[PDB]
Every structure is written in structure tokens, then in C-alpha cells.
């Protein structure tokens, strides 16, 4: 009653049935923050895949990103793109944005902890969104 | 359609009616992580005030704390106290644990952003829990 159980750390996301793979809320690189704020408050999801003109994931926009925008001492309005969050961090280049179904729980957990991020986008071979894995999903696997 | 509106940044938490002040789920410094994990998965709250023998807040235990525990390369079981999370960070000493009803939205937002934390415990004059303010609560105020 090692924590975490080693037999479950060696299992893939697919095997453990971890994540959300239906009804994914997401936005574009051309999406203004007002759109994302409306989603967060009315639709009630914790983070949003940000996809480019090809449908490929280039960022994740979270509730903390909005608060960080709100603390900026320079003047902003809500017509700023969600891509201005990229001035504060690059999940993409740090390799802490995406994951695959075949990756192990141990791998996914290490990636989350690596940059202190609360979610990863599950993608396909073309970096197109298949689903999302958040700490809540991991916790259900850790029990 | 400065974001955030200055007239709302200068208002207190009390004035804006921001936070949860009823039915707060919390744990003790003597609480094992298995207890917190059960709360997170079954009760479905995002973070837990950690209070000492006097009922004073000494930490907040979050879902990320469990994942961080799970990534530790040393051997753990679930009978570790929630206070082992304190090896990774001290919200208390950094002044990013607590807040008051009379503090401004601007103050609260800056504190969140200061340590990249997603919540603060609202306390009284004796550091006893009155409520909790999370990014979701702030977002409802930012609209
Ligand atoms: N953008 C999203 N669209 C749909 N479901 C999501 C999204 N972001 C997170 N979820 C799911 O919401 C549930 C709760 O996650 P969390 O809000 O982090 O506790 C999890 O099962 C996530 O996979
Ligand atoms: N330990 C807790 N007990 C009760 N409510 C909480 C607790 N932690 C967070 N909340 C509330 O849960 C709601 C959603 O917060 P969050 O899960 O961060 O999106 C907010 O109104 C928080 O104040």
C-alpha cells in the first residue's frame, strides 16, 4: 500500500480509462479572452485546448491565465487574444502541453509535476485534440 | 472595457460577495493523505484548508499536492500526513495562504499570482477558517 501502486503507474491512459474524450470545449488562437472567460463562467470547464488554423494544439488556456492577465500592470481589455498568455509560459516548447493514450500514468504524472500544470491535452499523430486529462482524472485512477 | 474593471479591483471580497462561506471541507495537520484523497474523489472539492490543534490554518492541501506525492521517487504509502506536502512549499511563510474579507480584489489577485496558487483561505483575527476563495470565485467577480 505503496502510493502510488506500481501496477497502475505502468499502465497507459488508454488502459486505465483516464480522461475526457467527449464534449471537449476548446478555442482557437484567434479567440479573444472574453470568449474564454464566458466559457469558464457559464460552461464550467477548468481549461481550454487552444488550436491553430489546422486544428493542432498550440497551448492550453486555463482559469489562472485569466487571473494572470488581470494582474498585468499594463492596460488590457478583454479583446486581447488567448495567445497573449504565451508571454508568461510556453507549455508547448517545454513539452508539458500534450500526451498520448499509450503513455504510462508514471510518464503523465511526471510531466504534470515537471512544470506544475494541472492538465494535458491528449492528441493524435497530427497534434489534433482527442481528449483532456486533468488532476481529477488522475485522482480517480490513483484510487 | 479595461480588463479588469478598476472599480471592481478596488472593492473588497466582502463587498463583491466572492467566495464560499458555508459547508467548507477541511482537514487537520494529523490527517493522513488517504483521507484527503477520499474527499477529493468522493466529495469533489478542489482544495482543503489544513488546520492545527487550535483550529488555525497552517496550509492548504490541493489535488496537485497528491500528484506531487505520487511523483516522489522515494517510497510512500497513503498513511503519510497531509503535512508532508510542506516539504515542497510553504504557502504560510510566503504569505500566500490566507486572506481577509476587507482585502481588495486587486490585493487578492496579486497574492494568487505571486506564488501561482489557485485559492486562499479567508480567515478571522485568530487565523480560523471563515471561507475559501478560488479562481472560479474570482472569475464570477471578473464578469
Ligand atoms: N475543456 C474541457 N472540456 C471538457 N471537459 C473538460 C475540459 N477541461 C477539463 N475537463 C474535464 O473536467 C473534469 C473535471 O476536471 P477539473 O475541472 O480539472 O477537476 C475532468 O474529467 C476533465 O477531463
Ligand atoms: N474545501 C472546500 N470546501 C467547500 N467549497 C470549496 C472548497 N474548495 C473550494 N470550494 C469552492 O468550490 C467552488 C469551485 O472552485 P474550484 O473547484 O476551484 O473551481 C468555489 O466556489 C470554491 O470556493
UniProtKB/Swiss-Prot annotation, chains A, B:
Phosphorylated by ULK1 and ULK2; leading to negatively regulate AMPK activity and suggesting the existence of a regulatory feedback loop between ULK1, ULK2 and AMPK. AMP 3 binds at residues 20, 25, 46-47, 118, 134-137. Residues 18-80, 92-143 form the CBS domain. The modification Phosphothreonine is found at residue 83. Coiled coil: none annotated. The modification Phosphoserine is found at residues 81, 90. ATP 2 binds at residues 62-65, 89, 97, 118-119. AMP 2 binds at residues 62-65, 89, 97, 118-119. ADP 2 binds at residues 62-65, 89, 97, 118-119. The AMPK pseudosubstrate motif resembles the sequence around sites phosphorylated on target proteins of AMPK, except the presence of a non-phosphorylatable residue in place of Ser. In the absence of AMP this pseudosubstrate sequence may bind to the active site groove on the alpha subunit (PRKAA1 or PRKAA2), preventing phosphorylation by the upstream activating kinase STK11/LKB1. AMP/ATP-binding subunit of AMP-activated protein kinase (AMPK), an energy sensor protein kinase that plays a key role in regulating cellular energy metabolism. In response to reduction of intracellular ATP levels, AMPK activates energy-producing pathways and inhibits energy-consuming processes: inhibits protein, carbohydrate and lipid biosynthesis, as well as cell growth and proliferation. AMPK acts via direct phosphorylation of metabolic enzymes, and by longer-term effects via phosphorylation of transcription regulators. AMPK is a heterotrimer of an alpha catalytic subunit (PRKAA1 or PRKAA2), a beta (PRKAB1 or PRKAB2) and a gamma non-catalytic subunits (PRKAG1, PRKAG2 or PRKAG3). Interacts with FNIP1 and FNIP2. Belongs to the 5'-AMP-activated protein kinase gamma subunit family. This is 5'-AMP-activated protein kinase subunit gamma-1. It comes from Homo sapiens. The chain holds residues 182 to 323 of 331 of the full protein.
